[PDB]
């Protein structure tokens, strides 16, 4: 390991593994998997029905007390049956640690809103509904937060076009800003950058 | 052969091969790779009609369509006819078939001639490469009559060469002694040799008798000559002797026919009459040239003040002799169906869009039908392909090559008429490499093929 390689920490790796096993033991009803990254990041995969309990536990337990919600986001993977992946990032100031909770959903199944647990989630959840179309149940006010009023479609889905469907201009006939089907003077050049000759043998998949 | 068209900002950049283990292995011929230069020259972009001076001038789509529809409505019967070129798709073929049927015409012809005597194009196995390209690798002897596969089907000849090198295939030829990149046994040039093979006097009959899996291939070049039906009868007799004497090995399918143009098999499957003899016997007064650039029919052998319609993409020998010109799309510009010499149907994809006012061929014919009042049922591409499935359901299966064997029926239907063989050697048009670079309108329009011809004729 030369100065060009990021050094490994083993103490934190073991600590995170032990705490992940601890959380798994306490909550066997919801926890489906626990992983620790090679760079000491602990992530927990749970059933969607356990968002309110597990988070509450992590917020309220004496050993955990993850009091801060750093971020709440969603990841779109169209090849999965449950399209959307809801990610909760939590920070514990008492133990100076970070955790990640991961959940799955689809276009029609809603997710319970964690506003009752973390207030910070409120706006975050709105953003998810705006950008991926994931519905959050029992939300104080769920509406668009980023897109234009009356915007049709959820732009952060992997099948939404990059340039959208409509574009805005001004019309002097009607004396107002109008929306028309999008037409680009220069179409976006699509570059095929993926190369053959795979780079990382550590991530090779079986040839089924 | 499968290809990949590489484009960039709506312009064809290059052509690359595509791996198909059963058709083109991994490669393509030089013409396929380097003839895309011809898609940018001598292009038809707008409709044209004759002006008062008798010259061709540009016009709108409505004017040209109305001018064609007036003559279509005025005439009827055998006075209306069409010829299909060598670069036409199944969609336009069935479209024009239906259009001329609605006016009660059956003069649907192709430039290449296939003998209609006996079974004709009624049995699919009567005009296909039944052994298939991937099946060439299982043969132990092979006989080639009246063909030069090196320039007539380069990938077929490459497969024969591979089987010759690896499977110790034995190759024999009847025709001119051309070079095939591998050594073969030259029986002769006269068609009479074929008869000897049927009689058993010629020792190659005995050599082929012991073959476990014999293959016989007859090229369309030998069928283009006036004695083609007699040649096909002789080759069918040879195959009959093979099956009855040496025994039926099973589903081997010895009889094979190798074609030269991509539009022939689909037209034969769609009921088109091969050859232009129907046009010659009953000259029409309005004629459709669906990309017809073979030069077979001139204005000399048509009635005076005949009406000629050319619909294609390139300006070639067939365009200036027309009265109304409709610009069509090329194979790089439309999703179109082509059936290869094996009988396998494959569809192209849209790489770029047709230039100027050019449209899709079947769309042009459908619009013409709507203007003339004989409106056709189909409106979209899927409806055209449903019509294709109605006429011939195997034109919508895009990777199947298998088919039933009807050799016995066509064989005993071929034994009725006995035309004598001519005393002319079987000389194919593709004698030398210089004759291979320019064969169709796309090739003749390219500087690359002109450079190839100039380099072949004289080299530094």
């Amino acid at each position: 390991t030369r100065p060009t390689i990021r050094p490994r920490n083993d103490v934190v790796h073991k600590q995170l593994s032990a705490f992940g096993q601890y959380v798994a033991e306490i909550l066997p009803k919801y926890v489906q998997q626990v992983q620790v990254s090679c760079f000491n990041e602990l992530e927990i995969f749970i059933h969607p029905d356990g968002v309110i309990p597990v988070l509450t536990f992590l917020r309220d337990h004496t050993n955990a007390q993850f009091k801060s919600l750093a971020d709440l986001t969603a990841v779109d993977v169209p090849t999965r049956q449950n399209r959307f992946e809801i990610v909760y990032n939590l920070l514990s100031l008492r133990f100076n640690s970070r955790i990640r909770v991961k959940t799955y959903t689809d276009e029609l199944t809603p997710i319970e809103s964690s506003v009752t647990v973390y207030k910070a989630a409120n706006w975050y959840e709105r953003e998810i509904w705006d950008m991926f179309g994931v519905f959050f149940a029992n939300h104080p006010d769920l509406r668009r937060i980023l897109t234009d009023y009356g915007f049709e479609g959820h732009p952060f889905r992997k099948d939404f076009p990059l340039s959208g469907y409509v574009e805005l201009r001004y019309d002097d006939e009607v004396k107002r800003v109008v929306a028309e089907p999008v037409e680009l003077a220069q179409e976006f050049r699509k570059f095929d950058l993926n190369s053959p000759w795979e780079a990382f043998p550590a991530y090779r998949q079986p040839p089924e | 052969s499968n290809i990949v068209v590489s484009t960039r900002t709506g312009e064809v950049m290059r052509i690359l091969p595509r791996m198909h283990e059963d058709i083109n292995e991994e490669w393509i011929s030089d013409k396929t790779r380097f003839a895309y230069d011809g898609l940018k020259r001598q292009r038809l972009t707008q409709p044209m009609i004759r002006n008062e001076k008798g010259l061709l001038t540009y016009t709108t789509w409505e004017d040209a369509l109305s001018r064609v529809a007036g003559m279509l409505q005025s005439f009827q019967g055998n006075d209306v006819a069409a010829i299909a070129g060598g670069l036409v798709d199944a969609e336009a073929l069935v479209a024009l078939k239906d259009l001329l049927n609605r006016v009660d015409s059956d003069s649907l012809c192709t430039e290449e001639v296939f003998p209609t005597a006996g079974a004709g194009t009624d049995l699919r196995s009567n005009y296909l490469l039944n052994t298939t390209i991937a099946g060439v690798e299982e043969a132990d002897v092979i006989l080639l009559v009246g063909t030069n596969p090196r320039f007539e089907a380069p990938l077929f000849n490459a497969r024969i060469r591979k089987s010759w090198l690896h499977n110790d295939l034995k190759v024999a030829l009847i025709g001119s002694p051309v070079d095939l990149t591998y050594r073969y046994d030259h029986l002769g040039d006269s068609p009479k040799i074929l008869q000897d093979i049927a009689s058993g006097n010629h020792p190659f009959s005995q050599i082929l008798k012991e073959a476990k899996k014999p293959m016989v291939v007859l090229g369309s070049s030998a069928l283009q000559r006036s004695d083609g039906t007699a040649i096909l009868a002789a080759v069918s007799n040879i195959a009959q002797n093979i099956r009855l004497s040496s025994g039926v090995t099973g589903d081997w399918k010895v009889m094979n026919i190798l074609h030269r143009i991509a539009s022939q098999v689909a037209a034969l499957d769609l009921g088109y009459k091969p050859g232009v003899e129907a046009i010659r016997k009953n000259p029409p007064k309005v004629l459709f040239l669906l990309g017809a650039d073979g030069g077979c029919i001139t204005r000399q052998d048509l009635p005076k003040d005949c009406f000629i319609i050319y619909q294609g993409h390139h300006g070639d020998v067939g365009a200036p002799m027309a009265d109304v010109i409709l610009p069509g799309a090329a194979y790089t510009e439309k999703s179109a169906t082509y059936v290869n010499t094996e009988g396998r149907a494959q569809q192209t994809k849209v790489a770029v869009t047709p230039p100027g006012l050019a449209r899709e061929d079947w769309k042009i014919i459908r619009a013409l039908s709507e203007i003339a009042g004989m409106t056709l049922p189909y409106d979209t591409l899927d409806q055209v392909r449903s019509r294709l499935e109605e006429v011939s359901p195997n034109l919508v299966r895009y990777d199947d090559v298998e088919g039933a064997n009807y050799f016995q029926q066509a064989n005993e239907l071929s034994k009725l008429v006995n035309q004598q063989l001519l005393a002319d050697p079987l000389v194919p048009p593709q004698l030398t490499i210089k004759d291979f670079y320019m064969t169709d309108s796309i090739s003749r329009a390219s500087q690359t093929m002109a450079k190839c011809v100039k380099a072949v004729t004289e080299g530094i």
Binding site: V182, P196 | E21, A351, T353
Partner: protein, 125 residues
């Protein structure tokens, strides 16, 4: 607690796509062919969904390439064919599927080069 409804999934009304870009477009589901310029095969592992080519024209100013459809650069990646077909049906797109092409195994042998009586005898090396 459970509807137990029996109907095919269809989220067409919720995606915000214009009506013309649904019943007219034709997606293609395929494994991309290997680039014959290279011998690597790492780009032929996944399935791709791509839309049909529409009209591109030249800009009167600067001569750039202008387009009008939004789905020109949209290519989706899927693990298996069934996943891609399910996605296409759920989104209400007509699709064409052609099966994966795998290179058949071949009997390679160096000693076949130096053959006593067969034709695999190489002229040089």
């Amino acid at each position: 607690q459970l509807i137990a409804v029996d109907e095919k999934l269809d989220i067409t009304t919720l995606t915000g796509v214009p009506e013309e870009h649904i019943k007219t477009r034709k997606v293609r589901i395929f494994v991309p062919a290997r680039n014959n310029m290279q011998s690597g095969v790492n780009n032929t592992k996944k399935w791709k969904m791509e839309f049909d080519t529409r009209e591109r024209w030249e800009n009167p100013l600067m001569g750039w390439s202008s387009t009008a459809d939004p789905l020109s650069n949209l290519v989706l990646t899927f693990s298996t064919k069934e996943d891609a077909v399910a996605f296409a049906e759920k989104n209400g797109w007509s699709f064409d599927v052609e099966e994966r092409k795998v290179p058949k195994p071949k009997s390679k042998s160096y000693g076949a080069n130096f053959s006593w009586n067969k034709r695999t005898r190489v002229s040089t090396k």
